Each structure stands twice: as structure tokens, then as C-alpha cells.
Design a protein around this ligand. Structure first.
Ligand SMILES: *[C@@H]1O[C@H](CO)[C@@H](O[C@@H]2O[C@H](CO)[C@@H](O)[C@H](O)[C@H]2NC(C)=O)[C@H](O)[C@H]1NC(C)=O
Ligand SMILES: *[C@@H]1O[C@H](CO)[C@@H](O[C@@H]2O[C@H](CO)[C@@H](O)[C@H](O)[C@H]2NC(C)=O)[C@H](O)[C@H]1NC(C)=O
Ligand SMILES: *[C@@H]1O[C@H](CO)[C@@H](O)[C@H](O)[C@H]1NC(C)=O
Ligand SMILES: *[C@@H]1O[C@H](CO)[C@@H](O)[C@H](O)[C@H]1NC(C)=O
Ligand SMILES: *[C@@H]1O[C@H](CO)[C@@H](O)[C@H](O)[C@H]1NC(C)=O
Ligand SMILES: *[C@@H]1O[C@H](CO)[C@@H](O)[C@H](O)[C@H]1NC(C)=O
Lengths: 399, 399
């Protein structure tokens, strides 16, 4: 099936970006780059200019002055906005949780791969030791039996070498667990902060409602400054989350060799492996293919040689029965482990995890960021109406 | 990792259920046991009883009668409730969409296995034809070359016979695509119905606000019966969704044996296969292992004597040199296809799809159903307050 970028991804991608140092920008995801970071900060600067324009407009309205139902409508609009904000916060938290689970499963898969390789090599080594025991048991050097034993030992050594070569995550500094725990850590703090902001806005709205119901002049003016502060906070939150959404949408564009380049810089793995596990198409062939065949061939060869020692050596050399059964059991166990490894070296083992990671990072996270945008716009409008209405009614109380 | 039942599913599982015929129900998911169906209908009956009690209480309130700010507070409470309803509808739609996507992916996987097995056996048949070509071009029957050719042909036939049985979804009547299509179909119909109900309640709330703001008595009495009807329909929706949530929670608690039995009754494949792909733990073992353990031998075995024809027949039989490359290419393609098949027969992919299906069906669907429960409760409370307040101030409207 694959991953299809959403409509919002292309809608935000086509947006023109500029810088005061140099307006032309490639509009291509590139962290640790001056132009991209400066443009993303300029987006928040534009949001701050919107803050300033709203403040000037409300000040002008108040100076020019210098209906309650409008205030109730504004606070109901704010309640709808904070519901949208709760939805968006839950959505983005779910998306980043999906991302963290994706890297957790990726680490589990890589661990399982290199692990199974490790004990497969260990079992092959124990098979080599028991084969040495069999040769020690072979006192009379028969023309064919010792040759079969030597061939089986060489085949076991070759299979051990190929299995040692199969492991690819061994010896890389990067591990997904360390880059998933930190992202979960940051996401937890971000969710906590936005939940606190949402609760503060709910308290502000409830204070407005209580002051209107109680007809308490004091309450109104006391929390008007808090309303102004939460308006400024919502404006700045819009700027920050809009920059985050723009960056995320630019990252989620259809071409993604950026992830491949970043991983090749960080882990240092060859591009053929990374291309295979990040594309999983018929154009890219398995980098582990040939080796995976060779080892299995050796294994098959071993079994054949084993049957020889099973069909001729056992009646002549009865003491070799138990070690031969030991080799047979090791062969069965290592063939099961080899099948598990081959199942774990396919694209779907990790390409599906990467697809789910991108799903959580775009189809969930970007939608959550847009819902935070809608939160910020609705909250700014509702609080502007509040600072336009409540002062017009503060002194206008019957007592 | 595995599937971990949540707290809500365990909380709803322990609830006691009763039936008018036979009170002690086993409280075990069984869509074929009648007592289960009457037990689930009893929840909707209890919700209807709550409807009746609320109607009696509001009628008593109006009869005993026979502040607007309370009405505004109730309307903002209803706005919060319908926001919760939006969230719950989106959550349950997302969960059922995840289930449908998992079922579609299960189809795509199984189709990949059986189509790939068909392609592999056809390629082995073409290899048999080319081996017959080698046999006919072998005019002089050398004591070793003809024996090697016969052994290669027999090994190819044995490998084809062993591989012909791998496809376990070739003969089953059930198709996951039809199940996914029908569950989707039902899902968008239910989503459309609930979206229409939510918009109807939003219109009711907006009409309430307009009636209070414009002091239009005529409108309020006209839409009072509308509010009563939406109250009744919300109570009925609460009953239906509560029954659905109870059933889903009772299912999600230890669903593996029930799903295994249902799939045994429908597909009728085998005990070992379904248990393997629904458990994927260490205790369950590969049922295809020996099968695969044979095939990967034969193909590899073939390669051995292929080198014989490469090492002795090539200088003697340049005509045989021509199709030997074709045979080797077929061997390479079938080895790649066999590795793909082995990667496709591990429980990891299908059990991962099943785990995602259960995740969407429980950890998302249960949350959606409980958010619908909250929607229903808050909507019932807000509408009860609305029918307790609006008749008071209908005639008390200033004009
Ligand atoms: C997540 O990553 C850590 C760090 O890599 C895993 O710890 C092991 O680290 C060793 C290094 O010698 C590697 O063999 C493997 O990467 C890891 N596996 C084991 C147990 O040997 C840690 O176990 C990983 N956690 C998960 C989810 O598997
Ligand atoms: C989904 O299942 C259907 C039905 O099994 C697949 O459609 C075809 O089904 C017939 C027999 O049922 C077989 O020829 C193949 O299993 C399918 N052939 C083709 C060309 O599709 C369908 O392929 C499955 N997968 C998808 C993605 O639809
Ligand atoms: C990959 O990244 C490095 C530095 O991170 C950069 O120099 C290089 O140009 C990138 N690759 C491509 C193809 O742009
Ligand atoms: C090899 O292991 C498999 C495990 O799937 C088992 O079924 C089979 O009997 C074993 N072979 C022997 C000879 O014990
Ligand atoms: C499986 O289902 C059938 C009918 O659907 C039922 O008769 C049988 O008892 C079930 N299995 C178990 C173990 O209960
Ligand atoms: C067999 O297929 C592999 C996979 O691409 C390839 O690398 C190898 O060269 C092929 N063998 C021959 C003899 O061409």
C-alpha cells in the first residue's frame, strides 16, 4: 500500500517562505540550517505581529469607547475552542506515542536479529566442539568417515562465518531506545504544559461566567489582566505550534531521502541496507540475499553429511550415537533460528514499522497541530471579544 | 510486547449481568447463546427506564410549577457534551477504520503468500520443462551425466510437491476483504447517523441561544418539542451504545480463544495454524517448519548437482551449456521467492496485524463508546435543565 501524504501536507508545503537575509529558500526540510530555522522563526514572528495588531485593535476600541449576550456567545465560542484544543492535544500526544512505540518496536526487532545471530553462532561453536569430540571418538581413521567429519566441520565453520556476517546492527553507536525515551519525555512535558494552559483558560472562562452571574465588579477587573495574559500566551502558542506544523508538513513531503541521509550520517550503515529497509520495493534487492543462501546451503550440506554418519558410522561406531543426536538437535534448533532470522531480515519487519512511524508523525501529528491552530484562532477571537465586552459592562452593573 | 487489556475493559467485564429467563448468565462472549442477547438488551431496557424516570421527574417539576443563567449554564454544558460527542465519534470511527485496515492487510498478506506459491510452482514447472530439454539434448547417456540430470529432475519435482502445500488460504471460502468492506460500510453509516444527531443537537442549542437572545416566545415553544424528541433519541442512543460497549468490553477480555473458535468454525483450517498466528509466542511452533526444512534442502540440493553439469557437462555438451544458465536463473529466482515466502509465513506479520486489529477494536473503540456515554449523560442533563427552565421563562419573556 505505502504511505500517501495528506492534503494538508501539500497545502502547507506550497506555502512560500522567505528570510530577511535572503528571501529565496529551497523550502526543503533541512535541520541545523540557518535559512530554514530563520524562516521558521519568522513564522512565529508573523504570529507575534498578529498579536500586536490584535492588541492595537482592542486598545483602539477601548479608547473609542472611553451587550452581555455578545459576551455569553464569546465565552461559548471559547468553550468550543478549548474542546477543540483538548482534541488536538490528545491527537498530537497519540501521534508522538505512536512514533515512540514505532522506534521501540524497531529496537526490539534489531535486538532480536543480532541476538538470534549471537546464539546461533554460539550453538554452531558448540556443534564444532561436539564434532571435535566425534573425531576424538574416531580412533580408526577410516577412509570416508574422517573425510565426512572434516567436511561437516568445514561446513559448520563456513556457516558460522556467514551467520557472523549476517548481523548488521552490531557495532553502531545509535540505538532507537535512547532516541525514543527522550522524544517521549519531551512529548510528556509538552502535553502537560498544554493541559495546564487549557485548564487555565477553562478557569478564566468559568470566572467570567461566575462574575457575570454573581454581578461582582471586583471579580471582573481582577481577572481581566489574567485574560490579557492568556490571550498573549495563546498568541505565542499559535506562533510556536504553527512553526512546528510548518516544519512537520515540510518534512512529511512525498520525497524522503532526508531520513536515509540522516541515518547514514548517524549510524554509518551502507546505503544499500538503508534503502532496502526504507523502501521495500522490487527495484531494491535484498543486501543479505546471497549470504543468506550460502549459509543455508552449508546447513543443508551438513545434514547430508550427517546422514552418512547416521547410515554407516553408527553401526560401526556405536559410541558416536549420542554426539550425532546432539548435532542433529543443534541442526534443528539452528534451522529454526535461521528461519526466524530470515523472517526478521525482510522489509516488512521494519518497513511496516517505519510506515507506522510516518503515519503517526504526519497523519496524526500534523492534524493535531492544525487543531491547535484552530484552538489558538478561536481563543484569540473569543478573548478579544471578552476584552471588548467585559470592560464595557464592568462599571455598567446595577449596584 | 503483546496485547494488554485496559482498566475500562476489566471494569466493565466484572459487571453482573442478568436475564429474565435465567438470571445467572456466564458473562462470557458468545454471540450464539440467547441469554447473552437478552442480557445485552437488558442494558438498553435499563436506559429506557432511565428515560422514563427522567420524563416523570421533569413532568413533576412542570406540574409543581403549574433563573435564566441556569439555562445558559445548561446550554454551555450541552456544548461541552456535544464536543465530547464529536471526540467519541471520531475515536470510534478511527478504531473501526484501524480494524478494517488490519483486515485488509491480512488479505493482502495471505494473497501475497498464495500468489507467490503459485508463481514458484509454475517456475518449478518451467524448470522441469527445461530439464526435459536437457534430457533430450543428452544424446549419449554418460553413466554419470544422465544420473545427475535424473536426480536434479526428481529433486525439482520433490521441491514442487513440498511447496504445493504451503498455501493454506487456497480453498478457504472466507475472504477478509468482504468482512472489511461490510464492517466499513456499517461504520460510515453509523458515523453519518451520529454526525447528523450531533448537528441536530447543535442546531437545538443554537436555537435556544437565539430564543433567549431575541426573546422570541414563538420560536421557543416550537423547538421545545424538538428538544424533547432529541432528548428521547439521545436516551435511546445511550441505551444502544451502552449495550455495544458492554458487549465489546466482554469480548475484549481474553478474546484469543473465542476468535480461534470462530475462525475454526468459519475457515476450518487447523488447530496448529490458527493458534500459531493468533499467539506468536515461544510455546507455539512452526507447523510448516519441516515442510520448509525439506524445500530449502531440495532447492539447495539441486544447486549441488547443477554445479556438476557446470563442471563436467559444459565442455562436453556446449548445447547443454545454453539452458544451464536458464536453470540457474530459475533456481536464483525461486530461492529469492522462497526467502520471501519464509519471511511471509512467520507469525510476526499476521500476529502484528491481529494485535493492531484488537488494539483498534478495544483501546480505541471502548474509549469512543465511553465518550458517547459521556455525551449521552451530559446531553440528558442539559436537556432536562432546558425543559425545566425554558417553560418557566417562555411567558416570562419581557415583550
Ligand atoms: C533497546 O536498545 C538497547 C541498547 O541497544 C538494548 O540493549 C542491548 O544492547 C546490546 C549491546 O550489546 C545489543 O546486543 C542489543 O541492541 C540490545 N539487546 C540485548 C538485550 O542484547 C535493549 O535491550 C533494547 N530494548 C528493546 C526494546 O529490545
Ligand atoms: C482480497 O481477497 C480477494 C478474494 O479472496 C482477492 O481477490 C481474488 O480472489 C480470487 C479468489 O477468491 C483469487 O484469484 C485471488 O485470491 C484474488 N485475485 C486477485 C487478482 O486479486 C484479492 O486479491 C485480495 N486482496 C486484495 C488487495 O483485494
Ligand atoms: C546529507 O547530509 C549532509 C550533512 O548532513 C549534507 O552535506 C549532504 O548534502 C546531504 N545529502 C544530500 C544528497 O543533500
Ligand atoms: C525438528 O524440530 C521440529 C520443530 O518444528 C519438530 O517438529 C521435528 O520433529 C524435529 N525433528 C526431529 C527429527 O526431531
Ligand atoms: C466453539 O463454538 C461452537 C459453536 O460456535 C461451540 O459449540 C463450542 O462449544 C465452542 N468451543 C468451546 C470450547 O466452547
Ligand atoms: C543470484 O541473485 C542475486 C540477487 O540479486 C545476485 O546478487 C546474484 O548475482 C545472482 N547470481 C548470479 C549467478 O547471477
Amino acid at each position: 500500500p505505502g504511505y500517501r501524504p495528506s492534503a494538508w501536507v501539500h497545502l502547507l508545503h506550497q506555502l512560500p517562505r522567505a528570510d530577511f537575509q535572503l528571501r529565496p529558500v529551497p523550502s526543503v526540510f533541512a535541520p541545523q540550517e540557518q535559512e530554514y530555522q530563520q524562516a521558521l522563526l519568522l513564522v512565529a514572528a508573523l504570529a507575534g505581529l498578529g498579536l500586536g495588531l490584535s492588541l492595537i485593535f482592542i486598545a483602539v476600541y477601548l479608547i473609542r469607547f472611553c451587550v452581555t449576550w455578545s459576551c455569553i456567545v464569546a465565552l461559548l465560542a471559547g468553550c468550543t475552542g478549548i474542546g477543540i484544543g483538548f482534541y488536538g492535544n490528545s491527537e498530537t500526544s497519540d501521534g508522538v506515542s505512536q512514533l515512540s512505540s514505532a522506534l521501540l518496536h524497531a529496537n526490539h526487532t534489531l535486538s532480536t536479529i543480532d541476538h538470534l545471530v549471537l546464539e546461533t553462532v554460539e550453538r554452531l561453536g558448540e556443534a564444532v566442539r561436539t564434532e571435535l569430540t566425534t573425531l576424538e571418538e574416531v580412533l580408526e581413521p577410516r577412509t570416508e568417515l574422517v573425510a565426512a567429519a572434516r567436511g561437516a566441520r568445514r561446513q559448520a565453520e563456513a556457516a558460522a562465518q556467514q551467520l557472523q556476517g549476517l548481523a548488521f546492527w552490531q557495532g553502531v553507536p545509535l540505538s532507537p531506545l535512547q532516541v525514543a525515551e527522550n522524544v517521549s519525555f519531551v512529548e510528556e512535558y509538552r502535553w502537560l504544559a498544554y493541559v495546564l494552559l487549557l485548564l487555565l483558560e477553562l478557569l478564566v472562562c468559568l470566572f467570567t461566567l461566575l462574575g457575570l452571574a454573581k454581578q461582582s465588579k471586583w471579580l471582573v477587573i481582577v481577572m481581566t489582566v489574567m485574560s490579557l495574559l492568556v490571550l498573549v500566551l495563546s498568541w505565542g502558542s499559535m506562533g510556536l505550534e504553527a512553526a512546528t506544523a510548518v516544519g512537520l508538513s515540510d518534512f512529511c513531503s512525498n520525497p524522503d531521502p532526508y531520513v536515509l541521509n540522516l541515518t547514514q550520517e548517524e549510524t554509518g550503515l551502507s546505503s544499500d541496507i538503508l534503502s532496502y529497509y526504507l523502501l521495500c520495493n522490487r527495484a531494491v534487492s535484498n543486501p543479505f540475499q546471497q549470504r543468506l543462501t550460502l549459509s543455508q546451503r552449508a546447513l543443508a550440506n551438513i545434514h547430508s553429511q550427517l546422514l552418512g554418519l547416521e547410515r554407516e558410522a553408527v553401526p560401526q561406531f556405536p559410541s558416536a550415537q549420542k554426539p550425532l543426536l546432539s548435532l542433529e538437535e543443534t541442526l534443528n534448533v539452528t534451522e529454526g533460528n535461521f528461519h526466524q532470522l530470515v523472517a526478521l531480515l525482510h522489509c516488512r519487519s521494519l518497513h511496516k514499522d517505519y510506515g507506522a512511524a510516518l503515519r503517526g508523525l504526519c497523519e496524526d501529528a500534523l492534524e493535531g497541530l492544525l487543531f491547535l491552530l484552530l484552538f489558538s484562532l478561536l481563543s484569540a477571537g473569543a478573548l478579544a471579544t471578552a476584552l471588548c465586552s467585559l470592560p464595557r459592562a464592568w462599571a455598567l452593573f446595577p449596584p
